[PDB]
Amino acid sequence: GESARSLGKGSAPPGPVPEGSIRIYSMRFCPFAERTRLVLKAKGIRHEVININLKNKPEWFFKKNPFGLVPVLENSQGQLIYESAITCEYLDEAYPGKKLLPDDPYEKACQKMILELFSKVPSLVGSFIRSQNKEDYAGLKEEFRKEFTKLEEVLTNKKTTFFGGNSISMIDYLIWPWFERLEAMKLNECVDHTPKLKLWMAAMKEDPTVSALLTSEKDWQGFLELYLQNSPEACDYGL
Amino acid sequence: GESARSLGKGSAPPGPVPEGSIRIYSMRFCPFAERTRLVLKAKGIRHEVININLKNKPEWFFKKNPFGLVPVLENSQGQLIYESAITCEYLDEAYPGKKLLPDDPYEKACQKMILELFSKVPSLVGSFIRSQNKEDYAGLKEEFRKEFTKLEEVLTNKKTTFFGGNSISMIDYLIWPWFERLEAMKLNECVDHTPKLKLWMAAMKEDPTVSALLTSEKDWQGFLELYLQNSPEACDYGL
Ligand SMILES: *CC(=O)N(CCCNC(=O)C(F)(F)F)c1ccc([N+](=O)[O-])cc1
Ligand SMILES: *CC(=O)N(CCCNC(=O)C(F)(F)F)c1ccc([N+](=O)[O-])cc1
């Protein structure tokens, strides 16, 4: 378990990524990097994980990503890919297995249009912790409602189990991490006027890849309390 | 020339797109939609243009794009694609001709990483007209400097004529429209500590596709003055 402890300030930069593997620089509670990890798991890609201490970053980490953000992929050839959506798509193209994005140009364009429908949700999750009372919480539940009703329409129009069709695909993995945190953020009743989106959540937790990666509510709260204090230990909560 | 006049509020929705063509809903001074038009021209795609009056939109236009934004593509099958970058990539995949994005997953990922380096520039252009004096203009030239130095690094690292290699490609077309407006916005000296980016601009204006689409500074100022008054005529400046 200790093997997953994060690298921070003072740590030695890492050696090369071995042939036959790809490396992901990540952080165990980071929903942006969960995306890439979902994709790695669904496609069966052999990989290694380096958790980055995002409150106490290694200086050499900016050599990996000048923005200082996880996730970052690094392969045996020494190529560096960052930005979550870009990492996920790189993996879908570069590796064999289940294709998560469709081949059809239009179908693929739809998945991205849907991604765009969702694009306000991550910064609402952010600003969810600018909320300090029952009033700001009310308003916030509303902002989440207006965005979830956009996704509800897509499911209503298509009448498919998942956003990309009847099978799970990239779009679902790209959005899942923020819905995973909804329960523990006390926002699960924002889906009660979106009955298909609510059924989508339940189908997601049944996906073997989702399920293998889900963080318990308990673990997530531990992380959150420490995150909100700029604690250098947040990243390693539980160890 | 009158053929290019915009459709506004009151206009009849359009008929179907004919077979052998794709339609772009656009606006002649919209840099987001210029992207899609650059791509249409570079790939030699037969198409028709409907200019949308963005200060006085047709109601039926929201049926084309629930966000109400140009550009939107509509094909003969009746499929609808919006968001500029998504339109451009759809076109690159769906149509024959010069491939604007590379086949290599990593090379393609780089183009998108560069796109991401540029992603603050469009809203700086926006906020460029929140500038009302020589002080806010000073600060603004600085904000533009910090972003252009990021692109300068990419050119320094690669030592290529264009951002995607020695040939012009998608990334260049995706960023060009905001650099096109820089002169007329009185920001051309923001490139004077980025000598490669400045040489990139000159090479761009030599590209036959760029050149066929460039709006004169004169035409652009006409548009801007009317835009800044919420004039329903802005869109059709010159006719
Ligand atoms: C890694 C990652 O995705 N982020 C985005 C965090 C968005 N907010 C949250 O997840 C919430 F408040 F916890 F709900 C990220 C960026 C930086 C850190 N950090 O510990 O400094 C964590 C997560
Ligand atoms: C169509 C398009 O790209 N936009 C973005 C405008 C960004 N600002 C500018 O170009 C500048 F101020 F002119 F420099 C867009 C959106 C809406 C309209 N409109 O006329 O309402 C025009 C352009």
By the 10 Å C-beta count (0-12 exposed, 13-18 middle, 19+ buried), B20 is classed as exposed
User: Could you tell me the distance, in angstroms and rounded to a whole number, from the CA of residue A30 to the centre of ligand 1?
Assistant: 5
End-to-end CA distance of chain B: 7
Q: Contact, B26 vs B64, CB < 8 A?
A: no
A84 is in an annotated binding site: yes
Of A81, A82, A113, the CB nearest to B86: A113
Alpha-carbon distance B167 to B153, whole Å? 18
> Which of the listed residues A7, A27, A53, A120 should we mutate to test ligand 1's pocket, taking the one with most ligand atoms within 8 A of CB?
A27
Question: Among all chains, which residue has been given the structure tokens 């201490």?
Answer: A53
Q: Does B114 lie in the same domain as B36?
A: no
Cis peptide before A31 (omega within 30 of 0): no
Q: Beta-carbon neighbour count of residue B142 at 10 Å? A: 11
Q: Does A139 lie in the same domain as A54?
A: no
Sheet holding B72-74, edge to edge: B47-51, B22-26, B72-74, B80-82
Which residues 77-106 on chain A approach chain B with CB closer than 8 angstroms? 79, 81-83, 86, 89-90, 93-94, 105-106
Q: Where are the alpha helices (DSSP H) in A65-194?
A: 84-94, 105-118, 121-127, 134-158, 170-180
Q: Does A191 lie in the same domain as A145?
A: yes
Q: Beta-carbon neighbour count of residue B72 at 10 Å? A: 24
Q: Does A221 lie in the same domain as A209?
A: no
Q: Contact, B87 vs B81, CB < 8 A?
A: yes
DSSP B117-132: HHTTHHHHHHHTTT--
End-to-end CA distance of chain A: 7
Give the range of the structural domain holding residue A112, as residue numbers without chain letter: 101-215
Q: By C-alpha distance, which of B164, B80, B48 is closest to B115?
A: B164
Q: Contact, B114 vs B107, CB < 8 A?
A: no
Alpha-carbon distance A201 to A214, whole Å? 12
Question: Among all chains, which residue has been given the structure tokens 């047709």?
Answer: B58
Please answer yes or no on whether A109 and B86 come within 8 Å at the CB atom.
yes
Per the document, the length of chain A is 239
Of B83, B94, B105, the CB nearest to A113: B83
Q: How many CB pairs under 8 A join A and B?
A: 42
Q: Where are the alpha helices (DSSP H) in chain B?
A: 31-42, 61-64, 84-94, 105-118, 121-127, 134-158, 170-180, 195-206, 208-213, 217-227
CA A155 to chain centre: 21
Q: Does A78 lie in the same domain as A18?
A: yes
User: Could you tell me the distance, in angstroms and rounded to a whole number, from the CA of residue A29 to the centre of ligand 1?
Assistant: 7
Cited resolution, angstroms: 2.2
Q: Does A166 lie in the same domain as A137?
A: yes
The CB-side HSE value for A189 (13 A sphere, CA atoms) comes to 5
User: Could you tell me the distance, in angstroms and rounded to a whole number, from the CA of residue A47 to the centre of ligand 1?
Assistant: 23
**Residues sharing a CB contact under 8 Å with residue B196, sequence separation 6 or more, in sequence order:** B152, B155, B156
* Domain at B68, CATH number: 3.40.30.10
Method: X-ray
Pocket-forming residues, ligand 2, beta carbon under 6 Å: B 27, 30-33, 54-55, 70, 125-126, 129, 181, 224, 227, 234-235
* Domain at A144, CATH number: 1.20.1050.10
Q: Is A235 a catalytic residue?
A: no
Domain tally for chain B? 2
SS3 state of residue A60: coil
Q: Does A172 lie in the same domain as A141?
A: yes
The annotated binding site of B for glutathione is made up of 57, 70, 83-84
Q: Does A87 lie in the same domain as A55?
A: yes
Alpha-carbon distance B175 to B85, whole Å? 10
Chain A interface disruption, residue of B83, B95, B152, most A CBs within 10 A: B83
Q: Does B159 lie in the same domain as B67?
A: no
Q: How far is CA B226 from CA B32, B51, B121, B122, B230, in A?
A: 19, 17, 23, 20, 7
Q: Does A204 lie in the same domain as A105?
A: yes
Q: How far is CA A50 from CA A24, A39, A47, A224, B38, in A?
A: 6, 16, 10, 20, 41
Alpha-carbon distance A237 to A235, whole Å? 6
What residues form DSSP beta bridges with A45?
none
Q: Does A223 lie in the same domain as A210?
A: no
Alpha-carbon distance A235 to A67, whole Å? 19
CA A162 to chain centre: 17
Q: Does A150 lie in the same domain as A136?
A: yes
Phi-psi region of B164 (alpha: psi -120 to 50; beta: other; left: phi over 0): alpha
Please answer yes or no on whether B105 and A94 come within 8 Å at the CB atom.
yes
Alpha-carbon distance B43 to B94, whole Å? 11
Q: Contact, A131 vs A137, CB < 8 A?
A: yes
Q: Beta-carbon neighbour count of residue A103 at 10 Å? A: 8
